[PDB]
Design an enzyme around this catalytic site. Sequence first.
Site, PDB file in Angstrom:
ATOM      1  N   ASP A  68      17.394  11.657  -8.111  1.00 24.22           N
ATOM      2  CA  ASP A  68      16.722  10.369  -8.122  1.00 24.22           C
ATOM      3  C   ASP A  68      16.400   9.942  -9.554  1.00 24.22           C
ATOM      4  O   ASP A  68      16.485  10.752 -10.478  1.00 24.22           O
ATOM      5  CB  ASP A  68      15.452  10.466  -7.275  1.00 24.22           C
ATOM      6  CG  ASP A  68      15.023   9.135  -6.691  1.00 24.22           C
ATOM      7  OD1 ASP A  68      15.600   8.088  -7.058  1.00 24.22           O
ATOM      8  OD2 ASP A  68      14.098   9.145  -5.855  1.00 24.22           O
TER       9      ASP A  68
ATOM     10  N   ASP B 281      15.401   1.060  -0.977  1.00 28.00           N
ATOM     11  CA  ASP B 281      15.226   2.010   0.115  1.00 28.00           C
ATOM     12  C   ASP B 281      15.226   1.293   1.449  1.00 28.00           C
ATOM     13  O   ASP B 281      14.573   0.272   1.619  1.00 28.00           O
ATOM     14  CB  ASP B 281      13.913   2.784  -0.029  1.00 28.00           C
ATOM     15  CG  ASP B 281      13.872   3.659  -1.268  1.00 28.00           C
ATOM     16  OD1 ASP B 281      14.930   3.877  -1.890  1.00 28.00           O
ATOM     17  OD2 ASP B 281      12.774   4.137  -1.616  1.00 28.00           O
TER      18      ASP B 281
END
Lengths: 390, 391
Positions: free
Chosen positions: A139, A200
């Site tokens: 990430d 997301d």
Amino acid sequence: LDNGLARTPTMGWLHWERFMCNLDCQEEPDSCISEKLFMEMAELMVSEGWKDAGYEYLCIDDCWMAPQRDSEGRLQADPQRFPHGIRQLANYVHSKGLKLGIYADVGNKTCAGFPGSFGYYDIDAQTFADWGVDLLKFDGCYCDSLENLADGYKHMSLALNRTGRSIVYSCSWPAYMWPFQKPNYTEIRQYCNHWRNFADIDDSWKSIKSILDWTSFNQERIVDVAGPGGWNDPDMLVIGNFGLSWNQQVTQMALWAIMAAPLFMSNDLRHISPQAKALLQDKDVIAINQDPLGKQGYQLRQGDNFEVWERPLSGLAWAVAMINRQEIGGPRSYTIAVASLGKGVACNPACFITQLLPVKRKLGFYEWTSRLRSHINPTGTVLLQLENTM
Amino acid sequence: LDNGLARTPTMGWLHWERFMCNLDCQEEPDSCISEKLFMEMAELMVSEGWKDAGYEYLCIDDCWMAPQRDSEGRLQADPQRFPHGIRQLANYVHSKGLKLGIYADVGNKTCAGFPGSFGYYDIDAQTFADWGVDLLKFDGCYCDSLENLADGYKHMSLALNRTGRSIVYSCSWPAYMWPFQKPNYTEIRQYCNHWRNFADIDDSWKSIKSILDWTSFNQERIVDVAGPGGWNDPDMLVIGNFGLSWNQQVTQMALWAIMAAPLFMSNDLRHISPQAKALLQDKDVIAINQDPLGKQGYQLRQGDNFEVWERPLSGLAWAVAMINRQEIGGPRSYTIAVASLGKGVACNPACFITQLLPVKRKLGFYEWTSRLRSHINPTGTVLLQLENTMQ
Ligand SMILES: *[C@@H]1O[C@H](CO)[C@@H](O[C@@H]2O[C@H](CO)[C@@H](O[C@@H]3O[C@H](CO)[C@@H](O)[C@H](O[C@H]4O[C@H](CO)[C@@H](O)[C@H](O)[C@@H]4O)[C@@H]3O)[C@H](O)[C@H]2NC(C)=O)[C@H](O[C@@H]2O[C@@H](C)[C@@H](O)[C@@H](O)[C@@H]2O)[C@H]1NC(C)=O
Ligand SMILES: *[C@@H]1O[C@H](CO)[C@@H](O[C@@H]2O[C@H](CO)[C@@H](O[C@@H]3O[C@H](CO)[C@@H](O)[C@H](O[C@H]4O[C@H](CO)[C@@H](O)[C@H](O)[C@@H]4O)[C@@H]3O)[C@H](O)[C@H]2NC(C)=O)[C@H](O)[C@H]1NC(C)=O
Ligand SMILES: *[C@@H]1O[C@H](CO)[C@@H](O[C@@H]2O[C@H](CO)[C@@H](O[C@@H]3O[C@H](CO)[C@@H](O)[C@H](O[C@H]4O[C@H](CO)[C@@H](O)[C@H](O)[C@@H]4O)[C@@H]3O)[C@H](O)[C@H]2NC(C)=O)[C@H](O)[C@H]1NC(C)=O
Ligand SMILES: *[C@@H]1O[C@H](CO)[C@@H](O[C@@H]2O[C@H](CO)[C@@H](O[C@@H]3O[C@H](CO)[C@@H](O)[C@H](O)[C@@H]3O)[C@H](O)[C@H]2NC(C)=O)[C@H](O)[C@H]1NC(C)=O
Ligand SMILES: CC(=O)N[C@@H]1[C@@H](O)[C@@H](O)[C@@H](CO)O[C@@H]1O
Ligand SMILES: CC(=O)N[C@@H]1[C@@H](O)[C@@H](O)[C@@H](CO)O[C@@H]1O
Ligand SMILES: *[C@@H]1O[C@H](CO)[C@@H](O)[C@H](O)[C@H]1NC(C)=O
Ligand SMILES: *[C@@H]1O[C@H](CO)[C@@H](O)[C@H](O)[C@H]1NC(C)=O
């Protein structure tokens, strides 16, 4: 990424959307992020046919780490929630014929605020390989510049390589770049097996629409770069949770197949409906997602609150998705000339058409000049597979 | 409106959301707006227990009319889609023990573009009464000013009254005022049995959230005027269609009960899931909606993506709804002091709490000082009924 992995899109389970960063094992021991949760999921992945369907990667997202590194500068699994450590979890997962995925961050912290891998790429890479990790989601939070972001993603790629262990490398790289700069997908593909492009996903139809709309808007930049070893990742399947109607769930499954997306379920495999299970294990739809040619599909046209997407498959076959975006009324009829499909060659001179979603049904042969009429539920999708007659 | 009608929120079926303005009986004979569609629904309203549950008004919305008035200046049913006319349909519906609702518009055209009632209020009122109409939904499209809008709604109310027939009068009046002028609900209640306040619902969670948020945002203005013979209308129930998850359907049913809303289903009674059917026919939830006291509920609190709504009921009881608006993750824990519920009197000295949705379950006795803990699905609602221990 030329590591021999992800020759088709990666299929698995990922805890994040459904279980998030739940650290409260006192009050919620059956849903907190712990070794027991993943052990249970691994058991059900075998017993409920998920592995058979092709879902082989059991993936830990963020919030598995201890607050600090140990005295040797290593990442630690939380002592209270993963008391037996990741190696033992990895061995348990491997004993089921499954593969373990784990999460780290290129910057100074994870997005949930746990230790980042900056300054520790080699150590962390070796830690994961030594543990037996088979996939790394990497990430991009808490990275102070896009140059440090890119450098770190490239460094970690090479570090994982040096371990000599086969590790699927998932990069959120372009998602953190897009707001500032256009990513170089040629560069990203060189270093990554797949890459998150956009925001997301959550448990809603709105989220799914935004991902599709972003993808179709930007399809000229991203579609052709995708292929065996390197995929666009539009984020997790949220089928079987709380916020989607049946039709919206069919839409996600169909369009994730069309997009050659990695198929990472995020749900509770202990509590999932028979209908949600059937959709997610649909062998014909999975076969489209897993097609060996690995050409990503795209939006062919949009208008009158309809969308038509298509994907070229191996063996001169095509997958065609028709989405009804009008969120009022009943099933709406859509007529398309098959000559418009597959750049005009899908049904030249003819093709056999099978509807796969929402129900499987053979529709017969269609000549090049013929037209296909379908009725599509609001927020639903009809998925067809075309077989050329040559 | 003081006509003895709508003493509880009107319950029924309204074709608009699910069937809309489908005029194509050639290609879609089973879904076009026709006398056959309504006759089939009326049959199912009886045979599938809807009438027994309380759903009695079978209502025609827009797109029933022929394009022109007749030579006597009357609205006509479309001759190809309603060849036997509205009177025979009304008679057919009356023979099932059901009531017939119809649609018209205060302006020059209906919203779908068909003949409006401006300049024909008396004639149309007389026409509907003669046909045996039991409810008029009166829309506000194609009205050149709000003064003409208000006058037209008042005129048609009086015109309906002069027929002598009991007709439930549903007014979209305030929805066309907002946000341009402040509706006067004392004035509106004087002329109407219920009134649409806000934008058209559609088959989406976005729409449901929009309606709830609008209502809670405006509750100080609209909640107190609601009561027997005069209700706020947040629009149709869209449960059993295509765009809502199970939890979102539970949320709509629960909050429409809390809101003392008319319960006009818009769905296909020929094709509806047993789950959807059970929810819409839920006797306990309908009992809350239909509470004789007719006090509309309200939002008690919001924070941390949670909402608590409550409604005062008859017999010292209260309905309490807890909504989880976080659309990510799993079921979320929520705790509230019962002394905060029902203005502090609901559970003083104690109350018995029964969960009604998403499943029915007795929770037990709660003393005034105790706390209520629940887990609520994302986009879902927990509906509770509180029963005070005095009686
Ligand atoms: C929203 O609409 C409602 C309904 O129209 C209003 O309520 C009405 O307000 C009027 C005042 O404009 C009241 O009329 C009075 O009624 C009493 C009877 O109790 C009469 O004594 C009184 O007569 C005096 O004033 C008249 C002026 O023309 C003269 O004819 C007389 O000679 C005498 O001087 C007057 O007729 C209505 O009773 C009242 N109706 C209802 C159903 O309550 C709203 O008005 C506001 O709310 C009211 C409750 C009241 O508090 C009013 O003072 C408020 O202005 C109106 N709301 C708004 C925001 O305008
Ligand atoms: C670390 O990085 C290095 C450098 O990229 C990487 O080496 C590469 O590995 C791949 C995959 O093993 C090699 O590609 C193979 O080459 C052989 C010989 O020509 C072929 O037989 C292979 O083809 C088969 O498999 C393919 C799927 O990968 C199929 O597409 C094909 O149909 C065949 O079935 C395949 O092309 C590549 O040669 C090297 N590259 C270099 C420069 O040496 C190494 O794998 C990485 N190590 C780790 C631990 O990740
Ligand atoms: C046209 O408009 C007129 C004027 O508003 C309207 O007349 C009103 O009708 C209503 C309903 O029939 C009357 O209300 C009744 O009044 C009597 C006492 O006079 C009461 O006994 C009645 O009680 C019933 O309803 C109560 C609800 O609170 C119940 O508690 C009880 O159990 C009874 O069922 C009821 O209140 C009203 O009196 C008249 N008003 C006037 C001024 O005449 C008429 O109905 C309208 N016509 C049409 C066809 O719409
Ligand atoms: C993670 O955090 C560390 C520590 O804060 C970051 O390292 C630091 O990065 C800053 C700016 O990125 C460096 O500042 C630079 O200093 C030089 C002078 O030596 C100056 O010429 C530059 O203009 C700049 O101001 C700093 O030296 C550096 N400090 C340490 C301890 O290494 C690191 O960048 C963070 N990593 C990520 C990926 O965000
Ligand atoms: C784009 C991207 O990687 N997003 C991730 C999400 O998938 C999840 O891993 C979360 C964990 O804290 O951190 C992020 O926002
Ligand atoms: C506010 C209001 O009455 N809305 C109505 C809707 O409910 C339906 O009747 C439609 C018919 O064309 O016209 C409108 O927009
Ligand atoms: C993208 O990256 C590749 C490999 O580093 C490079 O060859 C190419 O020039 C880059 N494209 C542009 C124009 O940035
Ligand atoms: C309807 O149309 C006429 C003629 O254009 C106009 O004068 C009248 O005001 C309109 N009525 C309404 C209610 O808008």
